[PDB]
Design a protein around this ligand. Structure first.
Ligand code: E1O
Length: 382
């Protein structure tokens, strides 16, 4: 028997840890789930179902239900694209587009681009964790409380818009080296913004944010460590790649992406590799000395990409190389991607060149629009 998952979403405030993901893998890999006689005695199972994008839960004595029955494959989007509010637009106006590129890689490696700038608040993938985190927050923390974090830019914008849509106040802390959209836009959206000229990276701002949190009593929402960030991309970004691939007729052989907190590619890889363990995750390691905005090297500390049981390969990519690739996707497809998108295109293009990859369809996740990166555009032309 099928019941609504919404009623049972207190498990989000009660399950901790990662042992619950064993349930996900089996349900995904099997393509079904066992009915629970007492949904409340199985909090691990129930959470797993939500995290894979189920909308309903299987309830009763001895039965099972498929992914389709559970609502993993439910179409959310109104065909007419009419939405009664922006937050409902983020939620229901999904998936983000999967576009097959005219870009041609060797060895029958077909490039598809998942355009995460089709998120309404930050025009970037960071919307998805921002809505998930703040939505759980709305359960506990009283309205008018100040919520805050460090960001390279996107999340700070996403946090500021979404905070204020939930009655919360926002503060964002940014490195001096972040772009002007990051420093400026949260202010337009009603946040405070703090820029540390001496912080060379977003991770290095973390102690300052924790220190001030202890002093002032704001809720440091902590995108690096907040399990909602991984979970949002499990039921959103990754699930979409699962569903789109299948509805698309794709022979999905891998994913390619970039790492900041590591939330989105950990989710894609884990979810996809639950379904089919051979699926490669090709991940970018920005080259040493170089800065690619929004992303970083793994060894600077990332929660999920280490701890979860995820097969991935790395490819080294310089800024200059991420910028070359922006330029060529612009000339191939007329679509203007961000630095970190080009980095992932490049990264896959190398594994493809090397002979390391099967022929078939790969999905790259493109985190944002290149329209926010005029300097790096300018410098890559001259
Ligand atoms: C342009 C762009 N590309 C990739 C990512 C990497 O995504 P995750 O690995 O975080 O899912 C991000 C996330 N950026 C975080 C900074 S670590 C933020 O906006 O504060 C980004 O903004």
């Amino acid at each position: 028997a099928l019941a609504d998952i919404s009623g049972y979403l207190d498990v989000l405030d009660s399950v901790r840890g990662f042992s619950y993901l064993e349930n996900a893998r089996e349900v995904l890999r099997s393509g079904e789930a066992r009915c629970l006689g007492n949904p409340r005695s199985e909090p691990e199972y129930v959470k797993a179902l939500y995290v894979i994008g189920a909308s309903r839960i299987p309830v009763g004595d001895g039965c099972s239900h498929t992914l389709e029955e559970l609502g993993v494959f439910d179409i959310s989007v109104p065909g007419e694209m009419v939405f009664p509010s922006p937050l409902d637009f983020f939620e229901r106006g999904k998936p983000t587009p999967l576009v097959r590129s005219r870009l041609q890689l060797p060895n029958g490696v077909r490039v598809w681009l998942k355009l995460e700038w089709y998120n309404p608040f930050s025009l970037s993938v960071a919307d998805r964790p921002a809505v998930e985190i703040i939505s759980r927050l709305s359960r506990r923390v009283e309205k008018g409380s100040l919520v805050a974090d460090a960001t390279s830019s996107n999340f700070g914008v996403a946090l500021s818009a979404v905070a204020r849509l939930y009655g919360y106040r926002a503060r964002v802390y940014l490195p001096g080296a972040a772009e002007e959209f990051g420093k400026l836009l949260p202010r337009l959206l009603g946040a405070q913004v703090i820029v540390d000229p001496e912080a060379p990276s977003t991770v290095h701002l973390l102690p300052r944010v924790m220190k001030d949190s202890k002093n002032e009593g704001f809720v440091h929402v902590n995108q690096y460590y907040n399990d909602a960030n991984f979970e949002a991309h499990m039921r959103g970004t990754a699930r979409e790649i699962f569903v789109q691939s299948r509805r698309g007729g794709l022979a999905l052989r891998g994913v390619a992406g970039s790492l900041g907190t590591s939330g989105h590619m950990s989710a894609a890889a884990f979810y996809l590799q639950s379904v089919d363990p051979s699926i490669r995750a090709v991940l970018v390691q920005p080259a040493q000395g170089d800065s690619i905005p929004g992303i970083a090297r793994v060894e600077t500390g990332m929660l999920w990409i280490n701890m979860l049981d995820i097969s991935y390969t790395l490819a080294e990519v310089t800024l200059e190389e991420a910028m070359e690739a922006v330029v060529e996707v612009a000339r191939s497809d007329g679509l203007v991607i961000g630095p970190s998108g080009g980095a992932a295109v490049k990264a896959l293009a190398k594994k493809a060149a090397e002979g390391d990859l099967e022929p078939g369809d790969y999905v790259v996740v493109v985190p944002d629009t290149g329209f926010k990166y005029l300097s790096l555009v300018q410098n890559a032309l001259e």
